[PDB]
Design a protein around this nucleic acid. Structure first.
Lengths: 49, 139
RNA sequence: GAGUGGUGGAGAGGUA
């Protein structure tokens, strides 16, 4: 509730910046998780790191 | 006692009046954004009760202020019954805790007495009002 | 258990 989500008047949802930043870091953390349990090549896993 | 169609008429009228005067307090349930949009998309058991256009509410508040100045306890129990939604079992226990069956008996007979006092003055206050007519055009 | 959304953010212009 400190990075809140109230939409616009026409139903379109306008967020804060922090939800986008957290979405980016969580998605890339999930992809790094998939590549670590996949045991990817070291160049690929260091690029995702 | 009183006839039952007059009884349900006063039940509906003071229910609407208590629903009107319950939408004015400050310590009230303020919703978030997400609960508001969940309520606007798919409601559950969150429905409300009808109120007035506040002039009818004004005149009935004026008649209960005029006649119910001499009794504090009946005014308090009709407020706490009509605004919050507490049962007579609940307000009987709430008044006995600070017997209980005779307490339930005295709160229902003071409710019956206050309704018997408020009904005919309410009928006269209803019939002696001019309905404001709709808007007209002169040429 | 009883109505309801801009602040958020940008850009432009104005007042003292």
């Amino acid at each position: 509730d400190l990075r809140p989500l109230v939409p616009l008047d026409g139903g379109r949802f306008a967020t804060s910046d922090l939800n986008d930043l957290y979405r980016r870091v969580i998605n890339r953390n999930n992809r790094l998780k998939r590549l670590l349990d996949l045991a990817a090549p070291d160049i690929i896993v260091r690029n995702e790191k | 006692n009183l006839t039952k169609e007059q009884h349900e008429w006063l039940n509906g009228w003071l229910e609407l009046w208590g629903a009107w005067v319950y939408s004015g307090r400050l310590e009230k349930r303020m919703s978030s954004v997400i609960a508001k949009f969940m309520e606007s998309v798919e409601p559950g058991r969150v429905m409300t009760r009808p109120m007035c256009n506040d002039d009818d509410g004004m005149l009935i508040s004026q008649v209960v202020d005029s006649v119910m100045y001499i009794d504090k306890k009946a005014f308090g129990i009709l407020l706490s019954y009509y605004a919050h939604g507490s049962s007579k079992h609940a307000i009987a226990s709430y008044y006995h805790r600070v017997s209980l069956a005779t307490c339930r008996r005295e709160v229902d007979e003071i409710l019956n007495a206050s309704l018997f006092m408020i009904y005919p003055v309410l009928d006269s206050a209803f019939k002696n009002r001019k309905r404001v007519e709709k808007i007209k055009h002169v040429a």
